[PDB]
Amino acid sequence: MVNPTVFFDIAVDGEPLGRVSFELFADKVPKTAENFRALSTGEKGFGYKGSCFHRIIPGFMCQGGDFTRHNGTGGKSIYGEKFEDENFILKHTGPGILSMANAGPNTNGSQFFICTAKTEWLDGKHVVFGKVKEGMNIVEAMERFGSRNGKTSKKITIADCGQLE
Template sequence: MKKKTKEFRPCKIPRYLVGSVSPHVLKTDLAEYNAHRYKIFTAKTKTDTKPPKMNPFNYVNVRKLRADAERLRIIDKENKQILKAINTVNRTIGRVDSYNPQAYACKSKWNAHVLTMKKIEHKNRAIYHKIMAASSSYDCETLRNSWLGIIKKLKMSSKFPLVILQKTSADVTFSKEPSISGGLEKFSERPICFLEFQVVDGVNLGRMEIELYHDHVPVTVQNFLSICCGDNKKKLTYKKCPIHRIVPGRFLETGDITKGTGKGGTSIYGKHFAEEGHKLKHAKAGVLSMVRVHKHNNNSRFCITFANMESLDKQNVVFGHIIRGIDNLFKIEGYGRRIGKPLAPIIISKCGKLNSVPES
């Protein structure tokens, strides 16, 4: 039977959507597409049936073939010997007639091993007797009596409290430091307020009593004292205000009663008020001064120095200094870091005004 030849059937459906191109483009594209299909349909394959030229000796190593044949011959011979031995075992039902003289050779070394162990035991016993016969060069009884005496003294001294006499407080020491007023005349009695600091949900850091120089910077002192007491129309207060910056060896900053970050603050006079004079100096530790806001303005933010800070004399307006509780200031300094952010959150737990007059 003759094979049926396939007929070429041109495609009648255009490849473009109807209406997307003009009829002329539609017809031309369909004709080119059918011509391409016809070329593929009528293409004939070309096959090269000639064998490649090759030399079998280039692919076959005669020396290796001979070596393999010799090895196969030897293996075949060994297999015949194994089969012969297996046949012998089967016929004699596994008879054993061999003896290995090396099988029990280790028993001949046991006596030598026992003798060696006895020598080691003899040496160990000699070392043991030497250790037991040794005596200490120290007088044990004297050491024991000395230790008992020390224990008796410790028990006796523990009955009495250790009192350090003539201890000078830090407040007295810092009161002898140079005055922040530099010898300026005292025009009136100066009010005294207090600030108590505490670690949030933690230890109480103590109270600091502050003398305010109302006779030299009345506007600044009135703003600070009013916020400290909380007796202003806006109900502003320093209570629960955080310390947002502590720089060891320099100062701490607080008083931001609006944001608590050092970027806020306000005053009883408005958002801020103008600076007063710079007569008072940062002459020692424990000096309070306002933190400058914008250009020559202040609000509620202030700082307390940990040392003499002459570099702040022309920047911050000084309005007071600590007269009691300077030790507590240095406790707060211990929470400081070089970057300024405290190691733990610290707030002003209590604040207000005192009626007592500072000691001379």
């Protein structure tokens, strides 16, 4: 088998920016990788398509995945509202790391963040499950619309998404 690859087509105020592809580490965190994969295809009847990155802090990360409230308070996994921290084998080693947002131990839903720098203080607390495969330049472009407090100056949305391989 091979690790699945998913893509997001990002738009800024409705204008297409570009595509970012991610490799999901199903071989190390199969349950977490599967949750993200299924939310990207929308196969369970809900998902990331049309949602926004509600919090972007330059030099830190881009956060998104709240497809229900769109403000950081919502979203849900494909296993129910929340699921356990699978493992902490992988670390936040640098730009491009894909990791799960949470509200403490065992509270994974649908929210995630893409790191734009090494964030070692999150190691052991947030489950790393993938990495940017192509399109890191689109992620860098995304940062331009963020701020120190996280509010974006333009609406950044996932116009389309799905599985490539």
